[PDB]
């Protein structure tokens, strides 16, 4: 009393166009991100000889964004070849480790800057410059350590495998057989809780508080703008919201909470890839928001260049 | 490397299945998908099971 149906999924018809366009845009992300982050680091290091109290987070953030951008060429090479990995296992492990560590570090430094901007009005207002410098250095070390700790487990299990029939080599994660669902789900939770939930919550709450504090004062609100703060919050959403929505839909597909069919395969492949390209505007937009808008930075850059 | 099934299920008995399905995929080759009527859910069956493989072969052979 069991009906054995069959379903054959054809090949992907129009994925070549998608991969072409994605690579075309990854080139621009790489070029612009590389240039912008290099300039930020250069001026941050070189502005200490003029007397500025340059900030550690905006230097570490620039370095982390630069490292992530450095691995785009590897991803493009793997992407153009229908998502195949000509390189060896060592290259895949190293690339994944570098990318993961620096991406997590970038997000964590954004959250830390959000908190520090508010504390700099309310709390770090009668604190000697030396004391606050020491506090910032300790926080930088801790954030880098935390990013590395989160990234290690995922890279541990990464292994390149050649399909026994397709004769094509891929690089994926091979978790222990006796527990794979408990691993996949688990990892996803982390990537959604320490990646979007907690960082976004802290960012939104503390930037609202900063806007309230600026509005209360008179000199501050005359000089400071309340639209750039809302720009910070909304930019984080636009970059990182659709990506996590697509990934969660993928997970619900894996757990068979949604019925399977070829349309979902196509409409989830397309969603994952398009959102992955969008989410990397993180590195392109970070300098343009925290550095290139500041009047002090623009004047300093103009002087240094000339 | 994305295919419909990422892991197996190796604790499903004959009495707990009401509708099987065989997926042919470009990446992961032949895969099975069962509909458990105890909770009306959908699971991915392990081909190693003695009864599953023989039942599916007669379905394909016919």
């Amino acid at each position, epitope marked *: 009393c069991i009906v054995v149906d*069959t379903v*054959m999924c054809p*090949n992907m018809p129009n994925k070549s166009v998608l991969l072409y366009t994605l690579s075309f845009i990854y080139i621009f992300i790489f070029v612009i991100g590389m240039i912008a982050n290099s300039v930020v680091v250069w001026v941050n290091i070189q502005a200490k000889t003029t007397g500025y109290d340059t900030h550690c987070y905006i230097l570490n953030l620039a370095i982390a964004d630069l490292w992530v951008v450095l691995t785009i060429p590897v991803w493009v090479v793997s992407l153009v070849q229908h998502n195949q990995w000509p390189m060896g296992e060592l290259t895949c492990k190293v690339t994944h480790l570098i990318f993961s560590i620096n991406l997590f570090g970038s997000i964590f430094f954004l959250t830390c800057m959000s908190v520090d901007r508010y504390l700099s009005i309310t709390y770090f207002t009668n604190t000697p410059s030396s004391r606050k410098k020491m506090v910032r250095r300790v926080v930088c070390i801790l954030v880098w350590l935390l990013a590395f700790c989160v990234s290690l487990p995922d890279t541990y299990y990464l292994k390149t495998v*050649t399909s*026994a*029939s*397709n*004769n094509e080599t891929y690089c994926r994660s091979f978790y222990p*057989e006796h527990s794979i669902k408990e691993w996949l789900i688990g990892m996803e939770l982390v990537s959604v809780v320490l990646g979007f939930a907690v960082p976004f919550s802290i960012i939104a709450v503390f930037y609202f508080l900063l806007a309230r504090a600026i509005s209360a004062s008179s000199d501050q609100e005359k000089h400071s703008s309340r639209k750039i703060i809302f720009s910070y919050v909304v930019v984080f959403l636009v970059c990182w919201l659709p990506y996590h929505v697509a990934v969660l839909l993928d997970i619900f597909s894996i757990l068979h909470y949604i019925p399977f069919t070829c349309r979902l395969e196509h409409a989830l492949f397309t969603a994952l890839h398009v959102t992955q390209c969008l989410s990397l505007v993180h590195c392109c937009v970070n300098p343009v928001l925290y550095s290139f808008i500041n009047r002090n930075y623009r004047y300093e850059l103009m002087k240094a260049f000339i | 490397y994305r*295919c419909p*099934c990422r*892991f*197996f299920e190796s604790h499903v008995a004959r009495a707990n299945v009401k509708h099987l399905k*065989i997926l*042919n995929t*470009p990446n*992961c*080759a*032949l*895969q099975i998908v069962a509909r458990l009527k105890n909770n009306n859910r959908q699971v991915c069956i392990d*081909p*190693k099971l*003695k009864w599953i*493989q*023989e039942y599916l*072969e007669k379905a*394909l*052979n016919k």
Partner: antibody
Framework: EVQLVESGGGLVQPGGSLRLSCAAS????????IHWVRQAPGKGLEWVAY????????SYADSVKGRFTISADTSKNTAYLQMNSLRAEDTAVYYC??????????????????WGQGTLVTVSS | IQMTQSPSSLSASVGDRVTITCRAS??????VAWYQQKPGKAPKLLIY???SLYSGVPSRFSGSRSGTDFTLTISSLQPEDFATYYC?????????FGQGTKVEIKR
């Protein structure tokens, strides 16, 4: 209920060419992978190649790569092995078998379930 | 991959213990198979995976595995079970049959 029939064997002068055809009837040809195997006269079995009927995931052995090719026609339900440049050591009996590549986590099923009845190939002058 | 298959031949009688072995030069994740061929007939699959008997094979045949060392045991050989047994591995995209063991009646 399941039938595999091989035809095309015979004599082949050195450097010649031949075409073996394996016609199948009795199973879902589009869900199975067809393998070709050898047996030299007096020696043991040696695997030659196969093809995934519905996707063309061909693979060849080391001693035949670049000389042997496979092509599967699902409309007619037949798998063809084209043999070229038969060196005197290619004389054997060629068997056609089929598999259902069930997905296991660490590998794919590859145990040849049903074997044909073999066709002789002689390579002599 | 080279699959050494010992011994070259076996001399056994009806009912006596019969054992064959197959060593894999590399690691195959239990992806082997054991066939038997009569002198003038096509091989008949006996075991797949590493120990899962085929659908219709008698229960005498039993496969095992220890790391990479696959044994085929035919308890209580009958007159029908006098053929040549071959060892295959299909973990890799290229399959390899063993040299093949021939069991002969002892007199």
């Amino acid at each position: 209920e399941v039938q595999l029939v091989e035809s095309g064997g015979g004599l082949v002068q050195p450097g010649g060419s031949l075409r073996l055809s394996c016609a199948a009837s009795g199973f879902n040809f589009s869900y199975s992978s067809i393998h070709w195997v050898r047996q030299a006269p007096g020696k043991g079995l040696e695997w030659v190649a196969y093809i995934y009927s519905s996707y063309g995931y061909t693979s060849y052995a080391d001693s035949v790569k670049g000389r042997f090719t496979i092509s599967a026609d699902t409309s007619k339900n037949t798998a063809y092995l084209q043999m070229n440049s038969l060196r005197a050591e290619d004389t054997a009996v060629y068997y056609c078998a089929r598999v259902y590549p069930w997905w296991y986590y660490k590998y794919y099923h590859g145990a040849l379930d049903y074997w044909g009845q073999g066709t002789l190939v002689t390579v002599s002058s | 991959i080279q699959m050494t298959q010992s011994p070259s031949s076996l001399s056994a009688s009806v009912g006596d213990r019969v054992t064959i072995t197959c060593r894999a030069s590399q690691s195959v994740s239990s992806a082997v198979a054991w066939y038997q061929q009569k002198p003038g007939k096509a091989p008949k699959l006996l075991i797949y995976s590493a120990s899962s008997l085929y659908s219709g094979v008698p229960s005498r045949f039993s496969g095992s595995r220890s790391g990479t060392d696959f044994t085929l045991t035919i308890s209580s050989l009958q007159p029908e079970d006098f053929a040549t047994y071959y060892c295959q591995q299909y973990y890799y995209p290229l399959f390899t049959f063993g040299q093949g063991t021939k069991v002969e009646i002892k007199r």
